[PDB]
Design a protein around this ligand. Structure first.
Ligand code: MYI
Length: 167
């Protein structure tokens, strides 16, 4: 048994809810929250800016030190950093950004990072301002992630479309 509440069960291991991932993280304090990161860990907007804003910019300060030491992530790659006030850990995962011309086939590689963690709170990768089709992102998630994933979908309209179209 875990602390996640009000999720619809899609498969053996994938759950979904219409929720603000920031508000969900603050309530649950999960072991792992996933950030929709870019390779520079520049948390300007979307899930990254909202998560970063909720940490009072401490996520961005930690991230800048990580990049100064290690250099940029790979598209499809990840790193584990602090979860600050939101979670034990933040798994920063880089899905391909369609609005920058990145290979959508890298979305499966991105979701494979989640299999290194038994339970995660996550957004859909490559959707929203990343320019991928969220229906596609949910299908890749279900067909790739084998660990227990709790998906938070911000847009109520999109949530309802994802549920009603799910195969
Ligand atoms: C605006 O920044 C982002 C970044 C990644 C995202 N993944 C999915 C969504 C849409 C949603 O949850 O409604 C989204 C939005």
């Amino acid at each position: 048994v875990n602390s996640f509440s009000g999720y619809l069960k899609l498969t053996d291991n994938v759950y979904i809810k219409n929720a603000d991932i920031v508000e969900e993280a603050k309530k649950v304090k999960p072991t792992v929250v996933v950030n929709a990161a870019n390779v520079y860990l520049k948390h300007g907007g979307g899930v990254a800016g909202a998560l970063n804003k909720a940490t009072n910019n401490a996520m961005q300060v930690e991230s800048d030190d990580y990049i100064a030491t290690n250099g940029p992530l790979k598209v499809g790659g990840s790193c584990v950093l602090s979860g600050h006030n939101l979670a034990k850990h933040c798994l920063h995962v880089v899905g391909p950004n369609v609005n920058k011309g990145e290979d959508i086939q890298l979305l499966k590689s991105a979701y494979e990072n989640f299999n290194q963690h038994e339970v995660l709170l996550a957004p859909l990768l490559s959707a929203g301002i990343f320019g991928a089709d969220p229906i596609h992102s949910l299908r890749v998630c279900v067909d790739t992630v084998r660990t227990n994933v709790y998906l938070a979908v911000f847009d109520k309209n999109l949530y309802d479309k994802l549920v009603s179209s799910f195969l």
